[PDB]
Scaffold this active site. Structure first.
Site, short mmCIF file in Angstrom:
data_model
loop_
_atom_site.label_atom_id
_atom_site.label_comp_id
_atom_site.label_asym_id
_atom_site.label_seq_id
_atom_site.Cartn_x
_atom_site.Cartn_y
_atom_site.Cartn_z
N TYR A 29 -15.71 -46.66 -64.65
CA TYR A 29 -14.69 -45.93 -63.88
C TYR A 29 -14.81 -46.27 -62.39
O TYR A 29 -15.75 -46.95 -61.98
CB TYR A 29 -14.81 -44.42 -64.14
CG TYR A 29 -16.18 -43.81 -63.87
CD1 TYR A 29 -16.48 -43.28 -62.62
CD2 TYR A 29 -17.15 -43.77 -64.86
CE1 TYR A 29 -17.73 -42.71 -62.36
CE2 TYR A 29 -18.40 -43.21 -64.61
CZ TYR A 29 -18.69 -42.68 -63.36
OH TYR A 29 -19.92 -42.13 -63.11
N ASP B 232 -13.95 -38.69 -77.71
CA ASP B 232 -13.63 -38.38 -76.31
C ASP B 232 -12.25 -37.75 -76.14
O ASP B 232 -11.23 -38.42 -76.30
CB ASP B 232 -13.75 -39.64 -75.45
CG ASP B 232 -13.69 -39.33 -73.96
OD1 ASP B 232 -14.25 -38.31 -73.53
OD2 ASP B 232 -13.08 -40.13 -73.22
N1 LIG Z 1 -16.32 -43.96 -73.95
C1 LIG Z 1 -15.67 -45.01 -73.45
O1 LIG Z 1 -15.98 -46.15 -73.75
C2 LIG Z 1 -14.51 -44.74 -72.53
C3 LIG Z 1 -13.86 -43.37 -72.56
C4 LIG Z 1 -12.76 -43.27 -71.61
C5 LIG Z 1 -12.38 -44.34 -70.81
N2 LIG Z 1 -13.01 -45.53 -70.85
C6 LIG Z 1 -12.58 -46.64 -69.98
O2 LIG Z 1 -12.68 -46.30 -68.60
C7 LIG Z 1 -11.64 -46.94 -67.86
C8 LIG Z 1 -10.89 -45.88 -67.06
O3 LIG Z 1 -10.33 -44.92 -67.96
P1 LIG Z 1 -9.99 -43.40 -67.54
O4 LIG Z 1 -8.61 -43.10 -68.09
O5 LIG Z 1 -11.16 -42.54 -67.95
O6 LIG Z 1 -9.90 -43.46 -65.94
P2 LIG Z 1 -9.69 -42.16 -65.01
O7 LIG Z 1 -8.90 -41.10 -65.75
O8 LIG Z 1 -11.03 -41.79 -64.43
O9 LIG Z 1 -8.80 -42.74 -63.79
C9 LIG Z 1 -7.66 -43.57 -64.02
C10 LIG Z 1 -7.73 -44.91 -63.29
O10 LIG Z 1 -7.49 -44.73 -61.89
C11 LIG Z 1 -8.16 -45.77 -61.17
N3 LIG Z 1 -8.35 -45.41 -59.74
C12 LIG Z 1 -9.20 -44.50 -59.23
N4 LIG Z 1 -9.07 -44.46 -57.89
C13 LIG Z 1 -8.12 -45.35 -57.56
C14 LIG Z 1 -7.52 -45.78 -56.28
N5 LIG Z 1 -7.93 -45.23 -55.11
N6 LIG Z 1 -6.56 -46.73 -56.31
C15 LIG Z 1 -6.16 -47.27 -57.48
N7 LIG Z 1 -6.70 -46.89 -58.65
C16 LIG Z 1 -7.67 -45.94 -58.72
C17 LIG Z 1 -9.44 -46.01 -61.96
O11 LIG Z 1 -9.89 -47.37 -61.82
C18 LIG Z 1 -9.06 -45.67 -63.39
O12 LIG Z 1 -8.86 -46.84 -64.17
C19 LIG Z 1 -10.79 -47.70 -68.87
O13 LIG Z 1 -11.17 -49.08 -68.86
C20 LIG Z 1 -11.14 -47.06 -70.20
O14 LIG Z 1 -11.03 -47.96 -71.31
C21 LIG Z 1 -14.05 -45.74 -71.68
#
Ligand SMILES: NC(=O)C1C=CCN([C@@H]2O[C@H](COP(=O)(O)OP(=O)(O)OC[C@H]3O[C@@H](n4cnc5c(N)ncnc54)[C@H](O)[C@@H]3O)[C@@H](O)[C@H]2O)C1
Ligand SMILES: NC(=O)c1ccc[n+]([C@@H]2O[C@H](COP(=O)([O-])OP(=O)(O)OC[C@H]3O[C@@H](n4cnc5c(N)ncnc54)[C@H](OP(=O)(O)O)[C@@H]3O)[C@@H](O)[C@H]2O)c1
Ligand SMILES: NC(=O)C1C=CCN([C@@H]2O[C@H](COP(=O)(O)OP(=O)(O)OC[C@H]3O[C@@H](n4cnc5c(N)ncnc54)[C@H](O)[C@@H]3O)[C@@H](O)[C@H]2O)C1
Lengths: 380, 174, 380
Positions: free
Chosen positions: A235, A135
C-alpha cells in the site's frame, strides 16, 4: 456450538453477515446456525432461503444472540450510549467477528472487554496472499469501485458512451480515477464497460501496467519517487508536499477535461490525502461530478461531506456513506464468505469447537480483545 | 451485371493498398462480425496500411449501433469518425470496405429525386478506388430500394455472412 | 425574422430547445435568435454561451415570445385549462415547433388554433431514414433507453457484471427489455455492455434479429401473428387478448428469474399496453426493479405511478417522468439540432423569410394546425 447473525440496526446498513451457501458450510462444519427474522431483507436474502439452507429463524435480536457462542455481524455492535444496547445482547465470553472499527471506536472495544467477548476486527486482516479470501475491505471496496461509476452516471446529465446519431455525435464521457487500488481498478473496468475514455493515476509503480491492461491511460508524474512509494503490505506511504505539487499540475491538464472524477485514495492509519483541492474544482467544467469514496476517512476532496451531495462551483461532489451497502445483495454473500474463510481453518473435525491459533498471524493481527483485556499492538 | 468476388480477391485488393476506410452497418451487427473486423484492421495496420472507421449517423437499427459493437471489439476511438470528419478522405482512400451496410452509401439520396431517401447525407464510398460490399445477397436495406453502386466496375460484391467472409479474408491474408 | 426559445416551465423538465451551435446556424440563416434568461441552466448552457453564439437574452417568457415569428419548445405549452396560460404568450400567426402530444391532447391544439398559431407536432414525424436528422422521438428515446439501465443499476442492489473474486463469485444481473424500439435497443446495448444477461421481447417480427444483433436473446411467443404486428410507419398495432395472454405466459418463465425489467412499449394515440400484470409483479423475486418508460402513457406495468418510485409486492416499480431530462445536457443540443434540420430547408437564404414546403411529407405529416384551422386528418 451455536452461531448467530443478527439484523444490522445502524442507519443505512442493508447488508447482512450470512448467505444461504455459507449456512450449508457452517452446518457442514457442525455449527447450529441462527439468523434474526428479516435480517437479509436489504440484501434480498429471505428467511425461507436461510431455513432451506438449514438454519433457525429467531424472531427478535435478543433471542438470536442469547445462546450464541460465536457472533457474525457486518458493522460494530451499538452500545447504550448510542441508544441501542447491542453489546449487552451478546453472550458473555463469546467471540465476535465483524468490521469493528477498532482503531477509531474504543468505547465499543472497552464495552466488549467488560463482557469478556473475544472480538476479531476484520478490517485489520493482514495484507498477505493467503488472507485475500478473508479480507472484507477488499471484497467490499471492489463493489464500491463499480458503484462509484453508477452513482457518477446517475448524477451526470450526459451519456457515457460515444454514439454517432443523426441529431449529432454524442461524445464519450471522460472519467479520471484517483487511486488505482481494488476500488480504482473496478471503477476503470466499469467506466470502460460503459464506453468512457478513462484516465488514472497512483503513487505505486505496479499500477501503471494494471491501468493499461484495462484500456486505461496512466498519468505519470515522477517515476523515481513512485518506485519507493509501496510499503511491505503493498500500500501507499506519505509522499509529502513536494510530490503533491508535481502531481496536481500533471493531473490538472486532464482534470479540466474530465467529466467524472472518482477519488479512492487511502493511506492506512493516516488521514486520506487531499488529491483535488477547491482551487482544482473551480477549474473543472460545470456539470461535472466528483465521487469521493474516501469521504468517511477525511475525503480526497475537502468539499465532500459524509452522506451528502455538495453542489459548488458548478460541480456535484458526491460523498455517500457506506458505499458497499448500496450494492448490499452482492456485498453480503461475499462478506459472509470472508468470515467463513477466516473461521474454517480453526474448526476441529471431531471435537466440534473453535480453536483460534495464536501462531497464525491472521488471528493475532485481527484480535482486538480476548477475555477481558485489550491485546492488540495498536491500542495498547 | 454484378462483379462478384471471393475472399482471396478481397485479400489482394487491400493487401496492396495504402489507405482503407471501413464502413460498418446493420449487417455487421446481425452477423456479429466485430472482433473479426477489428482483427482484420490489425493485420492491415501491421503492414503499414492506414485504417479508419466511418460511422454514418443512421447506421444500424438504433443511434450508435456500430459504436457499442466496435467498443466491444476494442477499436481505438481515435480511429472512429463521424460523417463530416471523414467524407473528404474517401477521395484519397484506395478501398472502401463496406461491411454489412447499404442505405448508408446509396447515391439515390443525392442523384435520384424520386427516391424515398432523397436529401439524406451519405458516405461517399464511390469516390474510393475500389468499393467492397459484404452482404449475403442482392437484397435491399431498410429503405427497400436498389443501390446503383452494386452495378459498376469500381465495385466488387463479396457474397456471404459478414463474420464468415471477414474471417475468410483474414485467413487469405497473412 | 425573430425566433424565440423559452425556459421549460413544467415540473421536472430541465431540457431546452436550443444550443450555442444551433444559435449561430440560425443567425447564419438570418434569424434574430431570442432566448429566455436561465432557459439552459438545467442543460449546462449558460446565458453567456448563448449570447456569445449570437442570441439575445430576454428577462421573462412573455418578452421573449411577444414578438416572435417562430417559437421552439420541448414540451407542449401549458393551456389555461391547466391554470397557467403559455399559449397566450405566443404571437398571433406565429410558428410553433415542439412535442405537442397532439393525439392525446386535443385541447392544446384547439387553444393554439384560437390564436391562429401554426403548430407542428414533432412527435408525428414519419420514421424514415431521411427524416432522422429532424426526429425528436429517436434522439430522446435513445437517451431514455440508456437512462433506464443507469436508473435500473442505481436502484438495483447487485452489480450488473459477473465478478470472480477471491471471496467468491457473484452472478450477473438478469435484464428483460419489453418493447424493442429505439429506447429498448439502447437499453439492451447499455445493459449488455455492463455485463448483464439480457432477454427481450416485442410484437414486431423485425425485432428478433435486432435483439440478436446486440447479443441479446429474443423471447418468441407467436411468430404467426408477429407478421402482421407492424403498421406501414413501423409502429405496433393493438394486439388483442388472445396474444396478450400468450405473451404473459411465455414471458413468465424468464420474468421469474429477471432482476431488472425495463418496459418501453407504446402505441400511437392509444394507452400503453399492459405487459406486466399485478399477478406478474407478485411472482418476481424480492429486490427486483421495474423501470416503466411508458408511465406517462399509463404504464406497461400499471401499478407504476408518474414521478414516483413505488414498492409493491417487494418489487421496486420506478416511473420517472421526462426521462430524457435526466440526460438534459446531451438531450437538449440533440433536440435543438432536430428542430434546426426540420426548419433549415424551408428558409429563404436571399430574402430571409420562412416559406414551408407544404407538400413535403415531413411538413404535412407533422402539421397539426395553421392560420386557425386544424389540418391533420387524425384530429378531424
Ligand atoms: N491481502 C492482500 O494480498 C491484499 C488485500 C487488499 C489489497 N491488496 C493490494 O494492495 C494494493 C492497494 O489496495 P487497496 O484497495 O487496499 O488500497 P487502499 O484502499 O489503501 O488505497 C487505494 C489506492 O490509493 C493509492 N494512493 C494513496 N495515496 C495516494 C496519492 N496521494 N496519490 C495517488 N494515489 C494514492 C494507493 O496506492 C492505493 O493503491 C493493491 O495492489 C491490492 O491488490 C492486497
Ligand atoms: N439507426 C437508427 O436509429 C435506425 C433505426 C431503424 C432503421 N434505420 C435505417 O436502417 C438503415 C441503416 O443502414 P445500414 O446500411 O446500416 O443497413 P441497411 O441499409 O438496412 O443494410 C444492411 C445490409 O446488411 C446486409 N446483412 C444483413 N445481415 C447480414 C449478415 N448476417 N451478413 C452479411 N450481411 C448482412 C443486408 O443485405 P443481405 O440481406 O443481402 O445480407 C443489407 O443490405 C437506414 O435506412 C436507416 O434509416 C436506422
Ligand atoms: N428509418 C429510421 O431510421 C428509423 C429511426 C428510428 C425508428 N424507426 C422505426 O420507428 C418505429 C417506431 O419506433 P419507436 O421506438 O417509436 O417505437 P415505440 O416507442 O412506438 O414503441 C416501442 C416498442 O414497443 C413495441 N410494442 C408495442 N406494443 C407492444 C406489446 N403489446 N408487446 C410488446 N411490444 C410492444 C413496439 O413494437 C416498439 O418496438 C420502429 O419500427 C423503428 O424501427 C426508424
Amino acid at each position: 456450538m451455536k452461531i448467530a447473525i443478527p439484523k444490522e440496526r445502524r442507519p443505512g446498513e442493508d447488508r447482512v453477515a450470512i448467505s444461504p451457501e455459507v449456512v450449508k458450510k457452517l452446518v457442514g462444519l457442525g455449527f447450529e446456525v441462527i439468523v434474526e427474522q428479516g435480517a437479509g431483507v436489504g440484501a434480498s436474502i429471505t428467511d425461507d432461503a436461510l431455513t432451506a439452507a438449514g438454519a433457525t429463524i429467531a424472531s427478535t435480536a435478543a433471542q438470536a444472540l442469547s445462546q450464541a457462542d460465536v457472533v457474525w455481524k457486518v458493522q460494530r455492535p451499538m452500545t447504550a450510549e448510542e441508544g441501542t444496547d447491542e453489546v449487552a445482547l451478546i453472550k458473555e465470553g463469546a467471540v465476535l467477528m465483524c468490521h469493528l472499527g477498532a482503531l477509531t471506536n474504543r468505547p465499543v472495544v472497552e464495552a466488549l472487554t467488560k463482557r469478556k467477548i473475544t472480538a476479531y476486527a476484520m478490517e485489520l486482516m493482514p495484507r498477505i496472499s493467503r488472507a485475500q479470501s478473508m479480507d472484507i475491505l477488499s471484497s467490499q471496496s471492489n463493489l464500491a469501485g463499480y458503484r462509484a461509476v453508477i452513482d457518477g452516471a446517475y448524477e451526470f446529465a450526459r451519456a457515457f458512451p460515444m454514439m454517432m446519431t443523426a441529431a449529432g455525435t454524442v461524445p464519450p464521457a471522460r472519467v479520471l480515477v484517483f487511486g488505482v487500488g481494488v476500488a480504482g481498478l473496478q471503477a476503470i473496468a466499469t467506466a470502460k464497460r460503459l464506453g468512457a475514455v478513462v484516465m488514472a493515476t497512483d503513487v505505486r509503480a505496479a499500477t501503471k501496467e494494471q491501468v493499461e491492461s484495462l484500456g486505461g491511460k496512466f498519468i505519470t508524474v515522477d517515476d523515481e519517487a513512485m518506485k519507493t512509494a509501496e510499503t511491505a503490505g503493498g500500500y501507499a506511504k506519505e509522499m509529502g508536499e513536494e510530490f503533491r505539487k508535481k502531481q496536481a499540475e500533471a493531473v490538472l491538464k486532464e482534470l479540466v477535461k474530465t467529466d467524472i472524477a472518482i477519488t479512492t485514495a487511502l493511506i492506512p492509519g493516516k488521514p486520506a490525502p487531499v488529491l483535488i483541492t477547491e482551487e482544482m474544482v473551480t477549474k473543472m467544467k460545470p456539470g461535472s461530478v466528483i465521487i469521493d469514496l474516501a469521504v468517511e476517512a477525511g475525503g480526497n476532496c475537502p468539499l465532500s461531506e459524509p452522506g451528502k451531495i455538495v453542489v459548488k462551483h458548478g460541480v456535484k461532489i458526491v460523498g455517500h456513506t457506506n458505499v458497499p451497502s448500496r450494492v448490499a445483495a452482492d456485498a453480503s454473500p461475499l462478506f459472509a464468505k470472508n468470515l467463513l474463510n477466516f473461521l474454517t481453518p480453526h474448526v476441529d473435525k471431531d471435537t466440534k469447537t473453535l480453536v483460534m491459533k495464536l501462531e497464525d498471524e491472521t488471528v493475532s493481527g485481527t484480535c482486538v480483545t480476548r477475555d477481558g483485556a485489550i491485546v492488540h499492538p495498536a491500542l495498547t | 451485371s454484378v462483379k462478384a468476388g471471393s475472399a482471396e480477391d478481397a485479400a489482394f485488393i487491400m493487401k496492396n493498398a495504402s489507405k482503407v476506410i471501413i464502413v460498418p452497418g446493420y449487417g455487421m451487427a446481425v452477423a456479429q462480425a466485430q472482433h473479426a473486423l477489428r482483427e482484420m484492421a490489425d493485420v492491415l495496420k501491421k503492414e503499414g496500411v492506414e485504417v479508419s472507421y466511418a460511422i454514418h449517423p443512421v447506421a444500424g437499427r438504433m443511434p450508435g449501433h456500430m459504436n457499442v459493437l466496435l467498443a466491444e471489439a476494442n477499436v481505438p476511438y481515435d480511429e472512429v469518425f463521424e460523417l463530416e470528419e471523414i467524407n473528404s478522405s474517401f477521395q484519397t482512400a484506395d478501398v472502401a470496405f463496406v461491411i454489412g451496410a447499404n442505405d448508408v452509401t446509396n447515391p439515390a439520396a443525392k442523384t435520384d429525386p424520386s427516391s424515398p431517401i432523397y436529401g439524406m447525407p451519405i458516405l461517399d464510398v464511390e469516390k474510393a478506388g475500389t468499393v467492397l460490399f459484404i452482404k449475403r445477397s442482392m437484397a435491399s436495406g431498410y429503405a427497400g430500394v436498389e443501390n446503383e453502386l452494386f452495378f459498376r466496375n469500381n465495385t466488387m460484391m463479396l457474397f456471404g455472412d459478414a463474420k464468415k467472409m471477414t474471417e475468410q479474408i483474414v485467413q487469405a491474408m497473412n
